[PDB]
């Protein structure tokens, strides 16, 4: 099984221990770890951060500890522009020129392969994201030849039914890329006003309309796109998403009036890290949805939908039933990798979760 996990750029500006830096990421604990974000510059991969070089070094060491373990730096991301993305795959010749300037970077910085985040294609993108994808890997084929470990290539997709058939030809760009990242953790948000999980596994016979929102029925429909189980990872939250209640009430339905007072340490409205979270319990009233299988929090006026080991570890059977090709954890740096908030002593305790169940039969 593989275990792709996300190490995101911007986490080592995080003040006191919500640093972090690729160094506290174990060796041992991923199978594949990706370096978020890349950009693009005048048509070409570029760094993002003043010290990327730096960091792309440093998370390239891990391999000097663990020889089986792969890295990839992921472009695109939220902070990118989805139009910007737009642009460079409509027209063939800045396309062609983005693709011709991967391997060269990717092999100087110690990369293994390239993820794509294009979040999210429209209507109008769909013929093109299959053509870079088509062309990127012909691209990796060929530039193998030179006698060097051929480039992997990967997307993070969209777990929502209508943007997956709105902007991807499943069947076509899964048969060029060697894995699929399922985003499966954006079902819910502070976008609507009422409270609900980011992440449900499953539907949950209650207040229906969505049927689409949860897990089961996004890996259901890759499967029946044409997506090989083979190359499909869903993917596991290491945050959870806030809100600040309008009423006294805190079950299904509950008021919302915006995004959750931020954390001490990812400072952002609408989202805790895990090891925030194990600081937010202390005091708080948790409950877990029985026919979604995932627990919430709740404190004075804030409202917490996030996933603990337990949820986590039944996600990865869930995957595993499917045979699926493994976990993407989104993110190192937002789980409680210094292990130090969570109680347990133990580093990871969401992702070495995941890992145990994925090292079970
Ligand atoms: C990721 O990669 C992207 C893509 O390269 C970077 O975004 C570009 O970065 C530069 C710097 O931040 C920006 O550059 C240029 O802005 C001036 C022109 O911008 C115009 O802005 C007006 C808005 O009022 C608009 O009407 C025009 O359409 C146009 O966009 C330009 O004059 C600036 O300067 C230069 O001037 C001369 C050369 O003509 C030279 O002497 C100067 O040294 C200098 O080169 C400057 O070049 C650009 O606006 C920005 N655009 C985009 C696509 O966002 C990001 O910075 C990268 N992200 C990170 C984190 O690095």
Partial sequence: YKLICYYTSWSQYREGDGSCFPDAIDPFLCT?????????????????????????????????????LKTLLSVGGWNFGPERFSAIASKTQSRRTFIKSVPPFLRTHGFDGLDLAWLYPGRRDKRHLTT?????????????????????????????????????????????????????????????????????????????????????????????????????????????????????????????????????????????????????????????????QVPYATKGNQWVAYDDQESVKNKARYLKNRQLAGAMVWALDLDDFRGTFCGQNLTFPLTSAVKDVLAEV
């Fill in 32 to 68: 594949h770890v990706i370096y978020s974000f890349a950009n693009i510059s005048n048509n070409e991969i570029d760094t993002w951060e003043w010290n990327d070089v730096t960091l792309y070094d440093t998370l390239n060491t891990l391999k000097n500890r663990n020889p089986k």
């Fill in 132 to 292: 870079l994808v088509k062309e990127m890997k012909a691209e990796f084929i060929r530039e193998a030849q030179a006698g060097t470990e051929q480039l992997l290539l990967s997307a993070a997709v969209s777990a929502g039914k209508i943007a997956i058939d709105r902007g991807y030809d499943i069947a076509q760009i899964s048969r060029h890329l060697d894995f699929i990242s399922l985003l499966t953790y954006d079902f819910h948000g502070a976008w609507r006003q009422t409270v609900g999980h980011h992440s449900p596994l499953f539907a949950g016979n209650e207040d229906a309309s969505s049927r689409f929102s949860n897990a089961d029925y996004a890996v259901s429909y890759m499967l029946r796109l044409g997506a090989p189980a083979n190359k499909l990872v869903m993917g596991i939250p290491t945050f959870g998403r806030s809100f600040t209640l309008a009423s006294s009430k805190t079950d299904v339905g509950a008021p919302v009036s915006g995004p959750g007072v931020p954390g001490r340490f990812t400072k952002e409205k609408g989202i805790l890290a895990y090891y925030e979270i194990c600081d937010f319990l202390h005091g708080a009233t948790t409950h877990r949805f029985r026919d979604q």
